[PDB]
């Protein structure tokens, strides 16, 4: 099954789905690179409370995840899967898709990320008290930046991050394997056509994204133990569902 004509159609549909569900246009992020937080604005973030900074980050992550849910809904083959499997895939892969998407908002020249209107370095996040997690996130974006991904490569690669037939809990594992295989063919065909197969060996191991997701859950457990009422009262419901229902409602709209 699936011929060359169908594989190229799948490439274009995935790229279109990605372009339609980007939270931020790449051009918009690039044209903000000179807009960097001053030392006074950096000090201001460092003086913010730990719970205020955690709440802000959980809110920004939840917004980004909402766009990944829309990407999945437009992704060829995804809505054809059962609701159980749609939820299993999003719960395990939404954070991973955001972790890949965020390289677009990272400037490797000065090691800054676009955050709340300006670019700032790791030191902007010191109030969180999760230095190892922040260093891991910046290192991950730095490693992705070195690949010089095109928008089309990010679309195909993030579709594969989401459509992973190895996720525990899948009820129709063979249907997810077939979708994964078609997407793998589309990604590799596009790399072959554009002479970009050299990136294959340089893509991060799957254990790297798993380690970032595990570090996030572990730091959230520590924070939630110190401020349980902050999480209950001020963290987004979708964030608590995924990391501590909403997904079912977003998938039905
Ligand atoms: O702009 S961000 O808030 C940001 C936070 C930390 C960072 F180092 C760089 C950027 C955002 C992001 C939010 C939470 C993330 O992990 C989970 C997490 C980490 C730390 C505290 C709470 C939650 C990762 C990324 C970028 C993509 C979507 C929003």
From Swiss-Prot:
Known outcome of mutating residue 64 to F: Completely abolishes transcriptional activity
Signals that turn on the gene: Up-regulated in the state of obesity.
Compartment list: Nucleus
Annotated NR LBD domain residues: 6-244
Domain of life where this protein originates: Eukaryota
Tissue expression as described in the entry: Isoform 1 is widely expressed in many tissues, including liver and adipose, and highly expressed in skeletal muscle. Isoform 2 is primarily expressed in immature thymocytes.
Effect of residue 134 to N: Nearly abolishes transcriptional activity
Membrane-crossing segments per the record: none
Motif AF-2 location, chain numbering: 238-243
Domain notes: The AF-2 (activation function-2) motif is required for recruiting coregulators containing LXXLL motifs such as NCOA1 and NCOA2.
Similarity-based family: Belongs to the nuclear hormone receptor family. NR1 subfamily.
Disease the record associates with this protein: Immunodeficiency 42: An autosomal recessive primary immunodeficiency characterized by increased susceptibility to concomitant candidiasis and mycobacteriosis. Candidiasis is characterized by persistent and/or recurrent infections of the skin, nails and mucous membranes caused by organisms of the genus Candida. Mycobacteriosis is characterized by infections caused by moderately virulent mycobacterial species, such as Bacillus Calmette-Guerin (BCG) vaccine, environmental non-tuberculous mycobacteria, and by the more virulent Mycobacterium tuberculosis.
Its biological purpose: Nuclear receptor that binds DNA as a monomer to ROR response elements (RORE) containing a single core motif half-site 5'-AGGTCA-3' preceded by a short A-T-rich sequence. Key regulator of cellular differentiation, immunity, peripheral circadian rhythm as well as lipid, steroid, xenobiotics and glucose metabolism. Considered to have intrinsic transcriptional activity, have some natural ligands like oxysterols that act as agonists (25-hydroxycholesterol) or inverse agonists (7-oxygenated sterols), enhancing or repressing the transcriptional activity, respectively.
Subunit-level organization: Interacts (via AF-2 motif) with the coactivator NCOA2 (via LXXLL motif). Interacts with the corepressor NCOR1. Interacts with CRY1. Interacts (via AF-2 motif) with the coactivators NCOA1 and PPARGC1A (via LXXLL motif). Interacts (via AF-2 motif) with PROX1. Interacts with FOXP3. Interacts with NR0B2.
Protein name listed in UniProt: Nuclear receptor ROR-gamma
Lineage: Eukaryota, Metazoa, Chordata, Craniata, Vertebrata
């Amino acid at each position: 099954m699936a011929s060359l004509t169908e594989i190229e159609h799948l490439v274009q549909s995935v790229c279109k789905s990605y372009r339609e569900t980007c939270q931020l246009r790449l051009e918009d992020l690039l044209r903000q690179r000179s807009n960097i937080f001053s030392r006074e604005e950096v000090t201001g973030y460092q003086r913010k409370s730990m719970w205020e900074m955690w709440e802000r980050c959980a809110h920004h992550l939840t917004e980004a995840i909402q766009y990944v849910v829309e990407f999945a809904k437009r992704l060829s083959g995804f809505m054809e899967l059962c609701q159980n499997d749609q939820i299993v895939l999003l719960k395990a892969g939404a954070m991973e898709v955001v972790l890949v998407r965020m390289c677009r908002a990272y400037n490797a020249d000065n090691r800054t990320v676009f955050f709340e209107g300006k670019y700032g370095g790791m030191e902007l996040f010191r109030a969180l008290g999760c230095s190892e997690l922040i260093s891991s996130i910046f290192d991950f974006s730095h490693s992705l930046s070195a690949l010089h991904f095109s928008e089309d490569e990010i679309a195909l690669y993030t579709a594969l991050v989401l459509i992973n037939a190895h996720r525990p809990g899948l009820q129709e594992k063979r249907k997810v394997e077939q979708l994964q295989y078609n997407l793998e063919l589309a990604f590799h065909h596009h790399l072959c056509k554009t002479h970009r197969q050299s990136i294959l060996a340089k893509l991060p191991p799957k254990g790297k994204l798993r380690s970032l997701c595990s570090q996030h859950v572990e730091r959230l457990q520590i924070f939630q133990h110190l401020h349980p009422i902050v999480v209950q009262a001020a963290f987004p419901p979708l964030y608590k569902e995924l990391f501590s229902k909403i997904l079912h409602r977003l998938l039905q709209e």
